[PDB]
Design a protein around this nucleic acid. Structure first.
Length: 49
DNA sequence: GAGCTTGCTACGACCAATTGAGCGGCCTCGGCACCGGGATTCTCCAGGGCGGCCGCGTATAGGGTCCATCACATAAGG
């Protein structure tokens, strides 16, 4: 489980490695960051939402 | 070479009428925007090591400093 929250520098530090297969099983994120960071989530494919 | 008076023409102000280039509306897929990644590359303190320079102090090379030795023609006897 990846908890995607924090200030942008640590936020992008948490992004590091997201593209690798099986880097994580589930990601949990808040709607504020979804409206903030939409590009990152939209680029990845998220199976069951 | 400039100023201006010429005598007047030829080209452009003005006008109906046609029509097609250009504008206004609308629609779209690929040029763009973001960054994940491996790789590039530059920063900056530590510092191996020579050795400039400094430190304890070995033993040593050298200068300003004080000492004098030395020359021209002279003092003396006959």
């Amino acid at each position: 489980v990846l908890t995607y929250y924090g200030s942008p520098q640590q936020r992008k530090e948490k992004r590091k490695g997201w593209n690798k297969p099986d880097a994580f099983h589930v990601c949990i994120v808040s709607y504020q960051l979804v409206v903030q960071d939409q590009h990152s989530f939209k680029r990845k494919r998220w199976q069951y939402m």
